[PDB]
């Protein structure tokens, strides 16, 4: 089965670093230079054994063909209104990128407004962020090449879809907010740096600045509106209040749901925007989140987590700003997380709640906060929404494990609010009635009850004979809610598989206390929760260890790699996508420094003591028992992943192959694939998505010897 040889990789035994008295060896530190011939040669040699391995079986061809078949369905974003026109994104099915469409009315003929597919031969130029002017006559949009986080902002006149000269460079992790006078737009950019800025470099991103761009001018003329040279990790995003009177500045440092909130009354500017604005520091600490919902004069509605881990709505009067004077509009729920809030039709609020990892959507009165209407949904997620203050209607998109989904429309001018199906798609060949979704709660090591979704064919015998695909993330206050995945459904239908998603701690499923439960010193809880999910699926007879595949991306890549090190006996197969593997060095590269609010930083002795215990790169260890080897492992990354620098995976696979792959008891493959012209994942063209999922389940099929079920 292993009809190849692992490439010889040079070990730099001199690369020894002292971490607070602990000596750490990093023999593959030279892989940190992406541009070197050594690194390029290493990548080439690895791809040379992985690709033939993945493609040897006709099962990949059968999966890709079926994936291409079943993924070929119409995909719509919500309709949204800007000015006198409606806009929406649409994919016929297999287009590399969705296309932005425009129509002059809800019943009128639609035409192409922005087609990103024509900007690249392989669909690797993607839209990343956009902002319409207040009156909807002008358009700003970000473009990213080859999956990099770097953005170029370009501009369009909407009427006639006319290209404008304005180009903004060095844009990354940026806001986009037009002042309501249409004169220009707020955005973020980074100062010039040495070396490259295309997404292949590893250079840390610091000193992000807020600029204002006056339309019709050169970027060189752009106004500097906020900077934090004493605080190089600070990031300030700007937005305009609904009335267009205030610029609100949300300043973040790290990834915790917290921000400073400064404001600038634009009326109070002496001569318009000409320099650093007269910021009024309403909230000048990082002790809570303050997310603008709406305002009425000086009374501002914010979604907050201040003393409310499940989130709530407060009113802050700018003329009476003390916390003691704040009014609680919609108090915190006992258990339900308030996911997001939008203001529509002047005085309505749309609240989205997460109840036991499922969405409910509600309409509330702005003045009192009182519940008015529940929008009836099935069990699943709200993944799209449209409806701002001046709008008199809402669009919202629903999805779930077995349903491609539905877009609903509701006219809010009507006395009795009737929401109707505006758009619906059904994937032919996938009979949703053949399958069921159950939610269970399994006890973790410490007795905590963890939610897990299980999707399987109806009527299966729980005798532990089915192959299983267990997914997890666990971090950064992210909630892994039900979603439609054709790729995972083919695994169920055509590979006889059971699919599982565990809502482990670190996520935001049960608020900030759930987040805190799997970060910093408590990070090990994530791995404990995920391992317990695996054991539950085994004990209940959904699967066996030799038939179980675990999967996660980025922070979830860290998850499955750590679980591989800690419990190799528990899994047959592990797929780690774009994973953070070097927990000691992660903070040094690109935006990695922002993740220390979840992980900690090896600069501190306390944090280093946490990190060394689970860091995938530093815990590759031959299993003590003779009957136990490492699971089959496939790492997936790409050369323009500047979110999680690919060196993470490169050093990890080298370590796996040397320490474990060399041993004679190891027959399970340990492989990496490094893609070109792709990045972390956002904006990845359909074609590449199909290639990836085909590789993944071809890896599973080969390593577990799974027959295709046509």
């Amino acid at each position: 089965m292993l009809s190849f040889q692992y490439p010889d990789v040079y070990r730099d035994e001199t690369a020894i670093q002292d971490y607070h008295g602990h000596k750490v060896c990093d023999p593959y530190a030279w892989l940190e230079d992406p541009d070197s011939e050594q690194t390029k040669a290493f990548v080439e040699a690895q791809n040379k054994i992985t690709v033939p391995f993945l493609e040897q079986c006709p099962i990949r061809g059968l999966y890709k063909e079926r994936m291409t078949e079943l993924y070929d369905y119409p995909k719509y974003s919500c309709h949204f209104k800007k000015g006198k026109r409606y806009f929406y994104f649409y994919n016929t099915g297999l287009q590399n990128q969705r296309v932005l469409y425009v129509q002059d009315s809800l019943e009128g003929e639609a035409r192409v407004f922005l087609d990103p597919n024509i900007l690249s031969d392989d669909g690797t130029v993607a839209l990343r962020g956009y902002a319409f002017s207040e009156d909807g006559e002008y358009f700003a949009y970000g473009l990213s090449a080859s999956g990099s986080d770097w953005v170029t902002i370009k501009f369009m006149k909407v009427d006639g879809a006319k290209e404008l000269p304005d180009v903004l460079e060095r844009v990354k992790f940026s806001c986009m907010a037009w002042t309501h006078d249409g004169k220009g737009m707020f955005y973020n950019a980074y100062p010039q740096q040495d070396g490259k800025s295309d997404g292949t470099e590893t250079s840390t991103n610091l000193h992000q600045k807020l600029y204002y761009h006056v339309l019709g001018t050169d970027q060189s003329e752009d106004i500097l509106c906020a900077e934090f040279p004493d605080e190089p990790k600070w990031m300030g995003g700007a937005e305009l209040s609904d009335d267009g009177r205030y610029v609100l500045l949300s300043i973040r440092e790290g990834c915790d749901p917290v921000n400073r909130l400064w404001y600038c009354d634009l009326q109070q500017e002496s001569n318009g925007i000409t320099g650093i604005l007269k910021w009024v520091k309403l909230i000048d600490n990082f002790e809570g989140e303050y997310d603008y919902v709406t305002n009425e004069g000086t009374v501002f509605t914010f979604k907050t987590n201040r003393h409310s881990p499940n989130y709530r709505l407060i009113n802050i009067d700018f003329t009476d700003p003390e916390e003691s004077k704040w009014k609680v509009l919609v108090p915190e729920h006992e258990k339900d997380v308030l996911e997001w809030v939008a203001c529509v039709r002047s005085n309505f609020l749309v609240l989205c709640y997460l109840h036991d990892v499922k969405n409910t959507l509600q309409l509330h009165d702005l003045a009192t906060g009182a519940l008015l209407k529940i929008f009836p949904l099935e069990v699943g997620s709200v993944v799209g929404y449209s409806g701002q203050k001046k709008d008199t209607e809402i669009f919202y998109q629903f999805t779930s494990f077995l349903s491609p989904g539905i877009i609903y429309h509701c006219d809010l001018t009507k006395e009795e609010l009737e929401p109707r199906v505006f758009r619906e798609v059904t994937v032919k060949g996938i009979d949703a009635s053949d399958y069921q979704t159950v939610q269970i709660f399994y006890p973790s090591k410490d007795g905590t009850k963890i939610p897990m979704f299980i999707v399987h064919k109806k009527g299966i015998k729980l005798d532990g004979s089915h192959p299983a695909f267990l997914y997890g993330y666990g971090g950064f206050n992210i909630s892994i809610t039900p979603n439609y995945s054709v790729s995972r459904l083919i695994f169920v239908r055509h590979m006889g598989g059971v699919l599982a998603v565990a809502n482990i701690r670190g996520g935001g499923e049960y608020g900030e206390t759930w987040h805190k439960g799997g970060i910093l010193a408590n990070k090990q809880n994530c791995f404990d929760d995920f391992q317990c999910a695996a054991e539950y699926l085994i004990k209940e007879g959904y699967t066996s260890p030799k038939r179980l595949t675990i999967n996660g991306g980025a922070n979830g890549g860290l998850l499955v790699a750590t679980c591989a090190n800690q419990r190799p006996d528990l899994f047959g197969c592990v797929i780690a996508q774009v994973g953070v593997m070097d927990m000691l060095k992660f903070h040094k590269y690109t935006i990695g420094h922002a993740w220390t609010t979840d992980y900690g930083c090896s600069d501190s002795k306390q944090h280093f003591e946490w990190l060394i215990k689970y860091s995938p790169l530093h815990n590759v260890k031959l299993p003590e028992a003779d009957d136990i080897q490492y699971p089959s492992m496939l790492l997936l990354t790409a050369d323009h992943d500047d979110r999680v620098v690919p060196l993470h995976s490169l050093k990890f696979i080298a370590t796996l192959q040397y320490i474990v792959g060399r041993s004679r008891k190891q027959n399970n493959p340990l492989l990496i694939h490094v893609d070109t012209k792709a990045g972390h994942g956002a904006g990845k063209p359909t074609a590449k998505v199909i290639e990836e999922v085909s590789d993944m389940f071809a890896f599973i099929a080969r390593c577990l010897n799974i027959d295709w079920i046509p």
């Binding site: 986080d149 992790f173 990031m235 990834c255 971090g475 950064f476 992210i478 980025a554 922070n555 860290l558 774009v578 953070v580 935006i591 922002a594 993740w595 979110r643 999680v644 972390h680």
Partner: peptide, 4 residues
């Protein structure tokens, strides 16, 4: 959005 700059989370991993």
């Amino acid at each position: 959005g700059f989370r991993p």
